[PDB]
Amino acid sequence: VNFPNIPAEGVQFRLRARDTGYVIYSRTENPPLVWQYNGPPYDDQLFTLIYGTGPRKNLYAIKSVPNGRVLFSRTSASPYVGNIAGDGTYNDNWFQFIQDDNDPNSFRIYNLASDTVLYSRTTADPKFGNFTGAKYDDQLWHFELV
Amino acid sequence: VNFPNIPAEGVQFRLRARDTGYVIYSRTENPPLVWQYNGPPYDDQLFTLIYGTGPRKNLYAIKSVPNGRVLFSRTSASPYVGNIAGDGTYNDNWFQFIQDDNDPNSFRIYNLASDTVLYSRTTADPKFGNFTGAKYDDQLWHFELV
Numbered sequence: 459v460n461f462p463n464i465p466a467e468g469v470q471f472r473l474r475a476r477d478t479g480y481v482i483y484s485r486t487e488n489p490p491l492v493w494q495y496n497g498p499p500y501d502d503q504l505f506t507l508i509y510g511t512g513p514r515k516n517l518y519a520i521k522s523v524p525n526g527r528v529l530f531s532r533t534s535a536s537p538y539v540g541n542i543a544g545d546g547t548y549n550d551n552w553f554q555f556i557q558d559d560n561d562p563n564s565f566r567i568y569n570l571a572s573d574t575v576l577y578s579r580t581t582a583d584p585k586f587g588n589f590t591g592a593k594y595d596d597q598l599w600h601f602e603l604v
Numbered sequence: 605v606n607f608p609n610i611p612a613e614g615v616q617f618r619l620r621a622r623d624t625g626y627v628i629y630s631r632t633e634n635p636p637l638v639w640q641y642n643g644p645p646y647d648d649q650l651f652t653l654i655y656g657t658g659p660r661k662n663l664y665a666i667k668s669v670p671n672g673r674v675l676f677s678r679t680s681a682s683p684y685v686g687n688i689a690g691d692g693t694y695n696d697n698w699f700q701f702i703q704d705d706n707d708p709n710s711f712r713i714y715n716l717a718s719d720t721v722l723y724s725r726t727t728a729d730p731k732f733g734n735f736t737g738a739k740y741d742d743q744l745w746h747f748e749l750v
């Protein structure tokens with residue numbers, strides 16, 4: 459089931475993991491360019507959504523406010539999670555927000571092209587990344603409105 | 605996770621529900637044109653897949669062997685599940701096969717356009733159709749190669 463409370467197109471938000479409380483950031487310089495962060499609000503944590511239409515209905519591109527790059531999540535090459543210029547040129551730029559089976563207020567950030575979800579953990583490296591497989595709580599996210 | 609044993613393009617199969625054991629048919633006369641069936645093998649129970657590419661990567665059109673029409677699953681108009689000529693002209697002709705979280709040998713027939721899954725049951729009318737909501741066992745399918 460698609461998450462019922464997806465931010466309106468163009469509305470700004472942070473993506474915060476339910477369990478770690480870490481936020482995603484997306485920047486242009488200094489690897490890792492997309493990663494997680496525990497600390498104060500910065501502009502590279504701000505995103506908006508481009509709403510997919512036609513064949514991309516129910517999918518969304520996640521665009522970074524300061525730099526305008528969209529997120530990707532792939533299994534084909536490293537880095538697996540990153541950003542790229544444009545408004546969603548590549549199929550791996552398109553995400554579905556899938557409501558959790560148990561928790562109605564959180565969702566998985568799912569990539570149809572790569573069959574992956576994003577995760578945030580405090581355990582082992584890599585502490586942020588993507589994953590194809592079973593459902594774990596560390597894959598659960600909130601939209602944090604600003 | 606995508607079902608790991610999806611038939612190769614052009615390979616013929618029936619779609620059989622795990623629990624009811626009923627099969628899907630797709631025909632051109634006598635509504636419902638797409639429904640479930642408990643009885644002898646007929647050709648209108650035979651399907652192949654058209655593999656999606658680009659924006660349709662990991663989606664598939666489900667094509668009738670005898671009549672060539674593809675399945676659709678929608679919520680915009682009746683019938684909600686039906687068929688239409690072509691090779692997946694419309695967005696709601698495109699399905700993802702999502703492996704069950706508990707049973708690795710079955711999958712849901714999921715529609716990205718409508719956020720629905722197909723179900724087969726013996727209980728309440730309509731006994732076959734599409735559904736947006738919680739995971740139930742009556743939503744579980746097998747590919748039955750012929």
Ligand SMILES: OC[C@H]1O[C@H](O)[C@H](O)[C@@H](O)[C@H]1O
Pocket residue numbers: 530532542548550551
């Ligand atoms: O969206 C990121 C983009 O990056 C690379 O350049 C690949 O060629 C693409 O397939 C895609 O993964």
Ligand SMILES: OC[C@H]1O[C@H](O)[C@H](O)[C@@H](O)[C@H]1O
Pocket residue numbers: 577579589594596597
């Ligand atoms: O969701 C990512 C997932 O991947 C790892 O392999 C761990 O075993 C899980 O605990 C979880 O962190």
Ligand SMILES: OC[C@H]1O[C@H](O)[C@H](O)[C@@H](O)[C@H]1O
Pocket residue numbers: 629631641646648649
């Ligand atoms: O597969 C369903 C099957 O059932 C009906 O009763 C018809 O007589 C057959 O032609 C076929 O459509």
Ligand SMILES: OC[C@H]1O[C@H](O)[C@H](O)[C@@H](O)[C@H]1O
Pocket residue numbers: 676678687688694695696697
């Ligand atoms: O794919 C089936 C097709 O059927 C209808 O006639 C509509 O025109 C389309 O939007 C689609 O629902």
Ligand SMILES: OC[C@H]1O[C@H](O)[C@H](O)[C@@H](O)[C@H]1O
Pocket residue numbers: 723725735740742743
């Ligand atoms: O998967 C369809 C689903 O829909 C119905 O409303 C029932 O409550 C469930 O038992 C199941 O049949």
